[PDB]
Symmetry: C4
């Protein structure tokens, strides 16, 4: 009904823009596939729907929509449920296509990612590359150091991620200081397999 019509109407607008700007069909297709994998044919207004609810109801809905992501992630599964809820509310859903570069080395990161579904390559230049999958996260090192990306991260497949900005990261750890160490440990651990400590 109203959701499907909101999508096909918006996809329509997108299909016109591509034509006006005469984009390569090499590109229009990526755009088309992105739209499928991101919306599945139904477009809502989360900002509006969720903005119109009380905070307790948002937390109940968000905790449910992410119950599976939470169950796969050691960081959460054993944490205070209020820490978890406080992080889920600050995350933003992002989809990434096979080949896409989620993060670039040398760059100045301002956000991290939690993998809901998909596989990503951590090409840490030189050698000793790595793969992370569902339940893992990355991009935290810059949120702690405030330096530059230690590696690059490329979608091997369609990824569903949840990003968290440095602002929201520090705001959560301000409230739950205990949980910083959980991040530090995995960070310094990851830096050891490279150059950091």
């Amino acid at each position: 009904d109203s959701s499907r019509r909101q999508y096909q109407e918006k996809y329509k607008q997108v299909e016109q823009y591509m034509s006006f700007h005469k984009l390569p069909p090499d590109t229009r297709q990526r755009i088309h596939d992105y739209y499928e994998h991101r919306y599945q044919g139904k477009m809502f207004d989360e900002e509006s729907i969720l903005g119109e609810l009380s905070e307790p109801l948002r937390e109940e809905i968000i905790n449910f929509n992410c119950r599976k992501l939470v169950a796969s992630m050691p960081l959460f599964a054993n944490a205070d449920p209020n820490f978890v809820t406080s992080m889920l509310t600050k995350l933003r859903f992002e989809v990434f296509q096979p080949g896409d570069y989620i993060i670039r080395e040398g760059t100045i990161g301002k956000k991290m990612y939690f993998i809901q579904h998909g596989v990503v390559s951590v090409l840490t230049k030189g050698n000793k590359e790595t793969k992370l999958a569902d339940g893992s996260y990355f991009g935290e090192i810059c949120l702690l150091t405030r330096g530059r990306r230690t590696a690059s991260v490329r979608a091997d497949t369609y990824c569903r991620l949840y990003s968290l900005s440095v602002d929201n990261f520090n705001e959560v750890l301000e409230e739950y200081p205990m949980m910083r160490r959980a991040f530090e440990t995995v960070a310094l651990d990851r830096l050891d397999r490279i150059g950091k400590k």
Copy 2:
């Protein structure tokens, strides 16, 4: 007419989102009841309507819509009417359901609440719990200390509240410094029945 249609059309959108995300009927019902108690079947655009009026007209409307809340509250009833008007303009209407946690201990509060209608439990961990009702307020302690919630507050029933952010709190007291003491007194008084002073 246009208000009712705006509601049932928006509630429609909400009912779809719930289905797409396959929420427990245990949850869909809470959402449904929330929507009833919050909108009563008519949805307006306060930001637009009120934004389109002069400041004097907003104050006249807001003072009238809150005349009853003002009459129940000792803080206001005896204060400079301009202090009162200046606070009413900064408040935000919030509804909370039976059982909901309005505030959590240990947490870093950034806003307080004034009860228009309803009853809330101040479970101050340990013992000596308390009940506040229509005309009372809470959550001011963190606005003064800038520390953490001294207790938890749970809706015993459907609550209608008006929240005030720390920013707007300090902005009002900047203009009406005399009124800080009224808040301090009730605060230090509340801290005594616990641990504060």
Copy 3:
């Protein structure tokens, strides 16, 4: 056509809100009259229309819409036309009703006003009250001192004003420092007829 329909449709929404909140007809009328005097039956989207034009075109339109206000005001008529244009772009149109209080003493002003059309009383408590009309401005003292309103200002009639915020005030004088003195002179002059210097 589209403008008139946008107004009567929005006024419709306003008429419903008043009914829902059961406002005194003493108030609904003020609201109704305000809407007439502010929109004249046609509602546009300045933010959209003007936002869609180049800066030079905005300045040309704004200079024309305010040519009469500019001609009545000694501050402008003899100033660099670029100073003038730079001020006009930052102003915001405001209508005020007979009896309305535009400014209150003791209060912390963050904006000034230029009278396009109407008469206002500067009731400086005590005695020696004053009247300002088309082409005059007021509320500058707090923009300079950063203190409190030295008097109150009440609409004797329907006023059409243009307000300027302290931010935009200081931003203009940052570019045209010479013009501060023009404001200071009238300010210190106004303070002398009271208490300031």
Copy 4:
């Protein structure tokens, strides 16, 4: 279809506003011509379309839409493609009419421009005026000095520009410090033909 209808509907609104404010046909025409040259009869919602895509897809689209601008500009053609992409994302499309003043001397610039198509006169008061065309840029001096415009710049013809704000300028050079010198060189070089060094 939907784009053309969005334009002619919005142009309609514009044509009414002009009439309501009784603008000189000397002005209505400039407005009309501006609208043609800026939209070409089709209006989209870039903020919405582009906001709904992943960052990698935006970069792919933006790099393509600006491939020609990039090919004409020595600054880019030889730079790290990621520096280039990082600048393109921050630019804003602006059209300017024959005679328009893009920049005024003595003024406090907060943005620079890259010429996609058109010719502009750098009237540096006094004497020794200059012309810049497709592929050139200007307005960088204030982004570096944080002072005032060294000259004025006037559209000799319809210009298509891309502006970059001081905020985005410093944010890019923060990530790609090497590229500051490329700007400094052309800047100090331009200052020499005048007064700067």
